[PDB]
Structures are given as structure tokens and as C-alpha cells.
Amino acid sequence: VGLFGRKKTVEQRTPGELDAMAAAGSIVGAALVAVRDAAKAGVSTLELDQVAESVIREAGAVPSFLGYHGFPASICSSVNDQVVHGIPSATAVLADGDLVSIDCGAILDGWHGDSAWTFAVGTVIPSDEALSEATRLSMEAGIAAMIPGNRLTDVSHAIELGTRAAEKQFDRAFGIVDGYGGHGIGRSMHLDPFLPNEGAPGKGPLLAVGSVLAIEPMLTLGTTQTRVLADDWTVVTTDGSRAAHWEHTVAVTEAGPRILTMRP
Numbered sequence: 406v407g408l409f410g411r412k413k414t415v416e417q418r419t420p421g422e423l424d425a426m427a428a429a430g431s432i433v434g435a436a437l438v439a440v441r442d443a444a445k446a447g448v449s450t451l452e453l454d455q456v457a458e459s460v461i462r463e464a465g466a467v468p469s470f471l472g473y474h475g476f477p478a479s480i481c482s483s484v485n486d487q488v489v490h491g492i493p494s495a496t497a498v499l500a501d502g503d504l505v506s507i508d509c510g511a512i513l514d515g516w517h518g519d520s521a522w523t524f525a526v527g528t529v530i531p532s533d534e535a536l537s538e539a540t541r542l543s544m545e546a547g548i549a550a551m552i553p554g555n556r557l558t559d560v561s562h563a564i565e566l567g568t569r570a571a572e573k574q575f576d577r578a579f580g581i582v583d584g585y586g587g588h589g590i591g592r593s594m595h596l597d598p599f600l601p602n603e604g605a606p607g608k609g610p611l612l613a614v615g616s617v618l619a620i621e622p623m624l625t626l627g628t629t630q631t632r633v634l635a636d637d638w639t640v641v642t643t644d645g646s647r648a649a650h651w652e653h654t655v656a657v658t659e660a661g662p663r664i665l666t667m668r669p
């Protein structure tokens with residue numbers, strides 16, 4: 406089997422299809438903003454879930470994470486050394502100094518959007534601020550590589566180069582999370598090709614106008630290795646270092662990359 410799927414080109418959406426995906430993605434965007442406002446010291450991650458879920462439903466969409474291979478919530482809420490897939494719960498209470506990653510997806514009229522970001526509760530630790538900003542820059546670096554005629558791993562390589570520049574910018578070593586990455590997305594949340602956050606340029610399928618990928622760098626302040634907790638979902642750094650996660654669903658167009666999961 407091919408690591409990157411069967412198709413020579415990442416499936417091209419039409420302009421109407423991209424608008425339909427962008428309407429799903431604005432809802433995810435709206436959900437992320439509402440969750441971030443609600444996310445104060447003393448609030449539980451389950452309260453955040455309820456906030457995200459309402460926003461999704463009141464806009465006429467459905468949360469794509471809910472019941473997804475058994476996942477119990479509408480968001481992942483991963484805190485500090487938790488990387489991805491944190492399960493919202495009444496006993497995960499946010500405290501001042503926490504680093505919070507929120508991951509969210511929605512479906513509207515059969516089309517998916519998937520986005521994530523990381524922010525601080527209260528006043529951010531300086532190492533954490535650099536971590537989250539480096540992750541965001543790595544995402545932006547990947548997004549800028551979404552041009553017609555590039556190949557999949559040009560995006561991977563641009564993400565990685567963005568990570569190393571952010572290292573030089575912050576005088577800090579960042580661990581690129583091993584074994585997790587982005588993906589194609591459209592009528593389902595997860596489609597081929599898997600998108601690495603690092604690797605040699607010029608491999609995997611071509612990008613063309615209309616091709617969409619979910620671009621999602623994950624960085625740590627230490628190791629590149631992770632394990633899964635006994636809850637079977639929550640992913641944590643093996644060394645206890647904190648981690649960040651940023652993501653957008655992004656289309657290649659004639660006029661340059663288009664974020665389909667825009668925030669209000």
C-alpha cells in the first residue's frame with residue numbers, strides 16, 4: 406500500500422465545494438473563539454465542550470468529533486504536556502499558567518472543517534509563549550507552501566523549516582512530535598494523504614488548484630516522543646515537557662492559500 410494514498414493529485418475541490426467547506430470551517434472558527442473566551446481559571450474542560458457544542462449546533466452543523474471512533478466529546482482539550490486528544494471532563498479544571506490546546510471539527514451539509522489552536526490561561530510562562538508561537542509559525546510556514554504544482558512533502562518540509570527558524574528566533578529547541586500529522590479532508594474528516602510535519606521536500610502527490618489539506622504542526626519543549634494515557638485517547642509527551650498544537654483546513658487556489666477555517 407502507498408503511504409500517501411493512490412491518487413497522483415490531492416483531490417481538487419471546485420469553487421462551490423470550497424465555499425461549502427469554508428461555511429463548515431467558519432463554524433469551527435466560531436466554536437474555537439467561544440471556547441477561548443470561556444476558558445478562565447476555574448472552568449472545567451467539560452464546560453468548554455458544552456460551549457463548543459452549542460455554537461456548532463446553533464449554527465446548524467454537527468460536531469464531527471462526537472462519537473468519532475467512540476470519542477465522547479465535541480472538542481479535544483489537551484492541557485500542558487498533553488499533546489492531542491485530551492478528553493473534556495468535569496475534573497480537568499483550568500488553572501493560571503496552563504497551556505491549553507483546543508481541537509474542533511464540524512460538518513455542515515456533508516462538508517468538514519478541522520482547526521485547532523493553543524493559548525494560555527492567565528499569564529503565560531515565557532517558554533510556553535515561545536512554544537505556541539513557534540507552532541503557529543510552523544503552520545503559517547506550511548500554509549505558504551500550499552501552491553499549485555508543489556508536492557505534498559514540500560508542505561512538510563516548509564513546516565519543518567518554519568520550526569527551525571522559530572528555534573533561531575526564540576533561542577530554544579523544539580521537539581517535532583513524532584508519529585502525528587495533517588491529512589486530506591472533504592466529505593470525511595480524515596482522508597489520504599497523511600501530511601507529515603517534517604521530511605525531505607518533493608515527495609507524495611501533487612497539489613493543484615482546489616486541493617485541500619488540514620495542516621497541523623505539533624511541537625514540544627523537549628522530546629519528540631509521546632505515549633497514550635490509560636483513557637485510550639489522551640496523548641502526552643514522554644518527558645513531561647509541554648506541547649502546543651495549531652491547525653487550519655487550507656485550500657490551494659489560483660490566488661494563493663485560502664484558510665477555510667477562518668475565525669470571526
Ligand SMILES: [Cl-]
Nearest residue numbers: 588595596597
Ligand atoms: Cl489519514
Ligand SMILES: [Mg+2]
Nearest residue numbers: 508509519520
Ligand atoms: Mg483538528
Ligand SMILES: [Mg+2]
Nearest residue numbers: 519587619621
Ligand atoms: Mg486534523
Ligand code: NA
Nearest residue numbers: 485487648649
Ligand atoms: Na499541550
